[PDB]
Design an enzyme around this catalytic site. Structure first.
Site, PDB file in Angstrom:
ATOM      1  CD  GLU A  87      48.843  65.092  34.190  1.00  0.00           C
ATOM      2  OE1 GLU A  87      48.104  65.682  33.358  1.00  0.00           O
ATOM      3  OE2 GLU A  87      49.413  64.004  33.985  1.00  0.00           O
ATOM      4  NE  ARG A 132      54.467  74.649  30.369  1.00  0.00           N
ATOM      5  CZ  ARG A 132      53.139  74.624  30.514  1.00  0.00           C
ATOM      6  NH1 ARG A 132      52.368  75.198  29.608  1.00  0.00           N
ATOM      7  NH2 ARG A 132      52.574  74.028  31.595  1.00  0.00           N
ATOM      8  NE  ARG A 135      49.355  62.543  31.520  1.00  0.00           N
ATOM      9  CZ  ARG A 135      48.383  63.035  30.723  1.00  0.00           C
ATOM     10  NH1 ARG A 135      48.144  62.450  29.540  1.00  0.00           N
ATOM     11  NH2 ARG A 135      47.629  64.086  31.114  1.00  0.00           N
ATOM     12  CG  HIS A 194      44.854  66.293  24.880  1.00  0.00           C
ATOM     13  ND1 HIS A 194      45.667  67.356  24.540  1.00  0.00           N
ATOM     14  CD2 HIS A 194      45.087  65.328  23.955  1.00  0.00           C
ATOM     15  CE1 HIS A 194      46.355  67.053  23.453  1.00  0.00           C
ATOM     16  NE2 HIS A 194      46.018  65.831  23.073  1.00  0.00           N
ATOM     17  CG  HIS A 240      47.162  70.356  32.618  1.00  0.00           C
ATOM     18  ND1 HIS A 240      48.158  70.037  31.706  1.00  0.00           N
ATOM     19  CD2 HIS A 240      46.935  69.238  33.329  1.00  0.00           C
ATOM     20  CE1 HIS A 240      48.503  68.769  31.863  1.00  0.00           C
ATOM     21  NE2 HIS A 240      47.743  68.254  32.818  1.00  0.00           N
ATOM     22  CG  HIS A 241      48.362  77.176  31.999  1.00  0.00           C
ATOM     23  ND1 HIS A 241      49.403  76.285  32.090  1.00  0.00           N
ATOM     24  CD2 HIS A 241      48.727  78.264  32.713  1.00  0.00           C
ATOM     25  CE1 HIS A 241      50.380  76.819  32.800  1.00  0.00           C
ATOM     26  NE2 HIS A 241      49.999  78.021  33.197  1.00  0.00           N
ATOM     27  CG  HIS A 271      45.364  66.916  30.977  1.00  0.00           C
ATOM     28  ND1 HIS A 271      46.259  66.470  30.032  1.00  0.00           N
ATOM     29  CD2 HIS A 271      45.162  68.229  30.704  1.00  0.00           C
ATOM     30  CE1 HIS A 271      46.659  67.491  29.288  1.00  0.00           C
ATOM     31  NE2 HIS A 271      45.992  68.565  29.664  1.00  0.00           N
TER      32      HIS A 271
END
Lengths: 90, 132
Positions: free
Chosen positions: B98, B3, B94, B129, B100-101, B125
């Site tokens: 965001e 990345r 945060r 997660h 993310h993949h 997220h």
């Protein structure tokens, strides 16, 4: 610096305007200033004062300073340091 | 770190509408809007973070996609910064949307495949997660 009573209303307006205009060199710096703003105001809405104003709230820099000032007044918290106006003449 | 290396953006993205960022707090988050993918497709980026900045800048240039952002959030995205989410969707420090993949890089998910990238609130997220 340490609490909102360390800011005059004008310094706090410069801070809020900085945030509103994203006048930073990085996102990290803007996020830090937003966090600092939340810590100064002690308002339960935190960053929502700036980014997600309550319908019918004035989200201009001066609008947001006013909302903070008034919410602090109403909840019995301390306010801004008085400014010392520069006078050019006697 | 893959990345952190250059690559080329590919993918179609998906038609989204008005409150596209409201979906970022639900499900697998929001997709990359088709119009943004159209603007970034076949372009080379230096890192995923360089891609991430272009996404928000392209968001700032899209009148439909940026119209639900307030003036302060619009100033942020115009600089390539991620827009702030509502306070109740932030997690600690945060505070911004965001990228993310979907399929992780370690399992063969591609870094710059725009169909493998989703936009989430920190809160969504962390939920995703924690359930892994």
């Amino acid at each position: 610096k340490h609490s909102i009573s360390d800011y005059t209303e004008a310094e706090f307006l410069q801070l809020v305007t900085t945030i509103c205009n994203a006048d930073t060199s990085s996102e990290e710096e803007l996020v830090k200033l937003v966090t600092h703003f939340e810590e100064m105001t002690e308002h339960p809405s935190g960053s929502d004062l700036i980014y997600y104003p309550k319908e019918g709230d004035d989200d201009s820099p001066s609008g947001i300073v006013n909302t903070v000032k008034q919410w602090r007044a109403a909840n019995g918290k301390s306010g801004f340091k008085q400014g010392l106006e520069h006078h050019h003449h006697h | 770190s893959k990345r952190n290396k250059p690559g080329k953006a590919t993918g179609k993205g998906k038609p989204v509408g008005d409150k596209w960022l409201d979906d970022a707090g639900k499900d697998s988050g929001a997709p990359i809007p088709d119009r943004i993918a159209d603007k970034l497709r076949d372009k080379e980026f230096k890192s995923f973070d360089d891609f991430r900045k272009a996404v928000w800048e392209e968001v700032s240039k899209d009148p439909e996609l940026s119209k639900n952002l307030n003036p302060s959030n619009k100033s942020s995205v115009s600089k390539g910064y991620s827009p702030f989410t509502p306070k109740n969707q932030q997690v600690g420090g945060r505070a911004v949307y965001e990228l993310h993949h979907d399929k992780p890089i370690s399992q063969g998910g591609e870094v710059y495949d725009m169909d493998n990238i989703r936009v989430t609130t920190p809160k969504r997220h962390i939920d995703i997660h924690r359930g892994k």
